[PDB]
């Protein structure tokens, strides 16, 4: 085809992003021939890639009106439609194409394929049935069956699905079986899924155990898993027990089978089941039904694993679990298993050097009585071969083994809760000892590469944790500075560490500085899926500190990732449908829904909305063009409150605190509720702001939204009154407390009431309304003055050679900036509506004088705030922060970084305020 050769230049141009030259070459090509619709659609695609969609959309509509037939044009139109997420058009396109040629099986397949991309289940079922009618192939029939299954799943009515679709699918598959046409293995999976979803467990188990079960060979032990599931559903305990025993005999390092065997044998003992008189006492093999048999089997596994040179951690943990379950059940006359403390000591002795010992012991540590925990720790200290402790030096290890054992011992000591008993001085002594141990142990890893962690970073982690606990207990920032210095020094030696970067980011964000945070996060090298998991740390702090550029960049990255997900997940589940992995379709659908209902997605979307509206509200546009191009309406909403899902990982930080002080599901629930409240408040505020230009019946909608906002604010205050404390490494509190303490909510509500009053006056057009307007103006001015007065102070303070920080002032300044921007918008609308009244009256209402005085007061307040910001900057730059040497240098560097971050934030704030001040000249009516 010569046309493909002609398109090859623009083909590679689009491949390389050469949009302009592609458009030029397409124009040159179409100058000779006017029937080359592919050239036109390629030009439209290139225009869309450059941000020209309306002309591209018109060209696409024009070429679609022609109803083409060549495959290349169809592919190009498909790509173009998927560019702005418009898959419904290709459905009609392929419908017309198959209308032209009804006997084309490829066209029917493509039409069904586009339907499956969309999700019209009856249509895919009909298309698949028609395709099978055209060509008798099993895969199309099973495609139709899967379409019916998905239609049943989608429907909420359980009875309707269990009565209409599932019986029909079962009848279809039964007819297929009667015809004896089951060849591949996917049909068996589909049949089993259909039978299981209908509740006929016995028939599914029979069909799996039958001849058709032999076709399941691609996977490993799949038949065993399905039999386990069926037995658990049917409560056929002896069979599951026998199968679990056989599988454990096969491989003796599987935890799930150990748990299943224990549960089965305990259920057997509870039911007092007895073996049959004759024949095998199972469908699988031997069955154990006595605790003596269980302990004998466990001992046999232990002694069999002992002989093998390779070491496994299975049987010992299984013995510990059996001890726990025997204790729980009530068999106090235990069958000579042993003292749990002795077993723990032996296990630690055998696996001292392995880094995973602590994690294994944490699960069972609850068995140890709290009376002799210190004695147990002392006993543990007697095996480690430490050097002799002299007067001026501590006992030190000799190689990697001793160091790892001592580290594990220290971790276990911290876990038991001893460290939460002594006072400040003993904690400081422990910190010094840990620091000395880390410094001594740093010598071993001299030859380690840059991509491998050092051997003693956990000493620094423990010291940092202790210092943070001390600071939280008493509140002395010198400990914070020391911890920051220690963390920086540790990160200097091991650039590849990950926990250090996260701890540094959290501490810096807590202290109010933000400049190093972006660099540290970039060094962390996050990517697509990690965004939705660990981007909340950046998104919760980027906006609150005035660093607008970083917030914009992060929001852009997150939005790009989410849009790419929304575009490509459907395509890849489509491909999975094509291949034949039927059982993976519902899981794919659930995964896509989970990703589409992420809380972080809505949070970043709303934050980007508000930031884009605020940055270029009136300095660039008139707040009307931005809204129109921004697609916002008061009634429209796209936040799924009923299906909000949380995906943030709260366990990324390594922890060693006891169970009581660790995170809990209650904390997660409270954090989710607080985040939902904050998101609701932000969304309501954005929606209320959005509908303002349309005021030039909606008043009722605005009043309803205002009432909802007031109720939400009341609920938020009630929740704040609870005074819930969070763990340091757990969820971080939101900004609601600072928002309430600042008092900007009253100013915004007063502005909204003033807007309502002026709109009512305009509709009516009275003296009482004018007096109310004047009183509202005076109250707004007083509230703004009070809010500004609440922000006065100093950011960095020097006292006795120590530094003190006050991020609350920065947060108050941010809230003040947002409030004054909103007030400026409201005043602009008020002047816009009021100006024609005075213009007509010129052909004496005291409202004009009050408005002019209010404008002058606003300008004076803005000038005073700008001057105060400049004075704060001048004081900050003139600060003389200069007042082992390496630690002092690190502390100086940390202080310099904090000062630079504060200066950058203040400069950005001053620039924004100076830009916003100029706009007040248009209000001089």
């Amino acid at each position: 085809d010569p046309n493909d050769r002609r398109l090859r230049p623009i083909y590679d141009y689009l491949d390389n992003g050469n949009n302009k030259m592609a458009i030029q070459q397409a124009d040159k090509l179409l100058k000779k021939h006017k029937d080359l619709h592919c050239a036109k659609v390629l030009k439209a695609i290139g225009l869309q890639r450059t941000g020209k969609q309306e002309e591209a959309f018109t060209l696409a509509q024009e070429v679609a009106a022609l109803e083409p037939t060549d495959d290349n044009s169809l592919q190009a139109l498909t790509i173009l439609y998927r560019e702005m997420h418009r898959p419904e058009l290709v459905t009609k396109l392929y419908e017309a194409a198959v209308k032209k040629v009804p006997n084309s099986e490829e066209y029917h397949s493509h039409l069904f394929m586009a339907y499956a991309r969309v999700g019209e289940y009856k249509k895919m079922q009909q298309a698949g049935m028609a395709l099978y009618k055209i060509v008798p192939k099993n895969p199309y029939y099973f495609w139709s069956v899967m379409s019916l299954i998905m239609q049943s799943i989608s429907a909420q009515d359980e009875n309707l699905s269990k009565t209409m679709f599932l019986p029909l699918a079962e009848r279809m598959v039964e007819k297929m079986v009667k015809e004896d046409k089951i060849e591949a293995e996917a049909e068996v999976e589909l049949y089993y899924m259909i039978l299981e979803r209908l509740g006929k467990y016995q028939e599914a188990l029979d069909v799996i155990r039958g001849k058709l079960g032999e076709k399941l060979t691609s996977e490993i032990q799949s038949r065993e898993n399905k039999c386990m599931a069926m037995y658990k559903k049917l409560s056929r305990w002896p069979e599951c027990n026998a199968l679990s025993r056989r599988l454990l005999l096969k491989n003796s390092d599987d935890w799930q089978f150990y748990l299943t065997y224990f549960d089965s044998v305990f259920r057997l003992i509870e039911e007092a089941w007895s073996p049959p008189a004759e024949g095998e006492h199972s469908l699988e093999g031997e069955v154990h039904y006595s605790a003596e048999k269980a302990v004998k089997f466990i001992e046999d596994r232990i002694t069999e694993e002992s002989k093998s040179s390779r070491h496994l951690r299975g049987p010992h943990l299984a013995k510990l679990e059996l001890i726990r379950r025997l204790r729980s059940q009530g068999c106090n006359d235990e069958y000579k298993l042993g003292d749990p403390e002795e077993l723990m000591f032996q296990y630690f002795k055998k696996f001292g050097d392995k880094p995973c010992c602590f994690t294994d012991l944490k699960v069972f540590v609850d068995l140890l009585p709290a009376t002799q925990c210190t004695k147990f720790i002392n006993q543990l200290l007697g095996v480690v071969p430490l050097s002799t402790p002299t007067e001026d030096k501590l006992a030190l290890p000799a190689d990697i083994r001793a160091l790892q054992q001592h580290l594990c011992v220290v971790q276990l000591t911290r876990l038991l809760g001893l460290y939460h008993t002594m006072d400040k001085n003993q904690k400081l002594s422990v910190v010094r000892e840990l620091m000395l141990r880390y410094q001594h142990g740093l010598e071993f890893g001299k030859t380690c590469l840059k991509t491998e962690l050092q051997f003693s970073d956990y000493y620094c982690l423990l010291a940092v944790h202790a210092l943070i606990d001390v600071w939280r207990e008493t509140g002395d920032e010198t400990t914070v500075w020391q911890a920051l210095t220690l963390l920086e020094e540790g990160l200097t030696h091991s650039p590849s560490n990950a926990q250090f970067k996260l701890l540094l980011v959290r501490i810096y964000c807590m202290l109010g500085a933000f400049e190093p945070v972006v660099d540290l996060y970039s060094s962390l090298d996050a990517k697509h899926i990690q965004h939705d998991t660990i981007g909340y740390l950046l998104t919760r702090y980027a906006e609150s500190l005035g660093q607008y550029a970083a917030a914009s960049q992060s929001c852009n990255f997150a939005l790009r990732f989410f849009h790419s997900n929304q575009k490509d997940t459907s395509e890849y589940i489509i491909q999975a449908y094509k291949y034949g992995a039927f059982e993976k379709i519902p899981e794919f659908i659930a995964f896509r829904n989970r990703l589409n209902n992420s809380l972080h997605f809505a949070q970043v979307r709303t934050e980007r909305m508000l930031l884009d509206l605020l940055l270029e509200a009136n300095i660039s546009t008139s707040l009307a063009e931005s809204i129109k191009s921004m697609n916002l309406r008061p009634e429209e909403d796209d936040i799924p409150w009923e299906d909000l899902r949380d995906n943030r990982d709260l366990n990324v930080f390594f922890s060693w605190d006891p169970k009581d002080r660790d995170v809990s599901e209650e904390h997660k629930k409270l954090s989710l509720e607080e985040e939902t409240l904050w998101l609701r408040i932000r969304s309501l505020t954005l929606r209320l702001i959005s509908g303002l230009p349309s005021l030039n019946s909606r008043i009722d909608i605005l009043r309803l939204l205002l009432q909802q906002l007031e109720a939400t604010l009341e609920t938020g205050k009630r929740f704040i009154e609870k005074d819930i404390q969070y763990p340091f490494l757990g969820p971080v509190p939101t900004r609601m407390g600072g928002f309430f303490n600042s008092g900007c909510s009253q100013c915004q509500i007063s502005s909204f009431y003033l807007v309502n009053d002026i709109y009512e006056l305009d509709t009516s057009g009275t003296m009482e309304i004018q007096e109310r307007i004047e009183n509202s103006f005076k109250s707004l001015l007083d509230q703004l003055k009070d809010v500004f007065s609440k922000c006065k102070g100093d950011l960095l303070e020097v006292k006795d050679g120590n530094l003190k920080t006050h991020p609350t002032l920065l947060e108050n300044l941010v809230f003040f900036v947002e409030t004054i921007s909103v007030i400026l918008w409201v005043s602009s609308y008020c002047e816009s509506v009021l100006r024609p009244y005075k213009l007509n009256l010129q052909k004496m209402p005291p409202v004009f004088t009050s408005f002019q005085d209010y404008v002058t007061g606003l300008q004076t307040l803005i000038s005073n705030v700008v001057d105060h910001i400049k004075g704060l900057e001048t004081h900050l730059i003139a600060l003389k922060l200069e007042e082992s040497p390496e630690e002092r240098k690190f502390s100086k560097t940390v202080q310099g970084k904090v000062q630079s971050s504060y200066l950058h934030s203040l400069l950005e704030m001053g620039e924004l305020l100076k830009k916003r001040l100029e706009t007040t000249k248009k209000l001089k009516i």
Partner: protein, 158 residues
Amino acid sequence: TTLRAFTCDDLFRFNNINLDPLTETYGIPFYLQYLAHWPEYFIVAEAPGGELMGYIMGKAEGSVAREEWHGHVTALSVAPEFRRLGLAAKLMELLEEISERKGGFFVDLFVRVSNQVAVNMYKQLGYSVYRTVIEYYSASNGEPDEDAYDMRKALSRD
């Protein structure tokens, strides 16, 4: 330990593994394609406490006519605190067995040149170096594009 098939929901809990600089983080299309096309080549280990030690992800391709039908290893990672336990050897043995059951011919994988420990452990496992490819790793952040070693091992069918 506990070995089971990888699932989509596990993508939200494996963050404690990819933080290692030596391990990558592919996009959603890569994981979705590998899971849909070859579900059996996706194994993940789960700890008694609920954590994930590591996972192994691979694929099979080639031409049987030219005896190119072979298994390929895409990704293999282990958590830093769960190493020195032979988990990688167990996963590699499982992949070798499952590829042998499919009538393959050999197994191959790429490796970083500077990653000396991985090369040594592979050589200990009977794997013999095949060849070297120049500038395979498209390094970012200004780092030089490190070359890669084409690592190979035979099978029993031949």
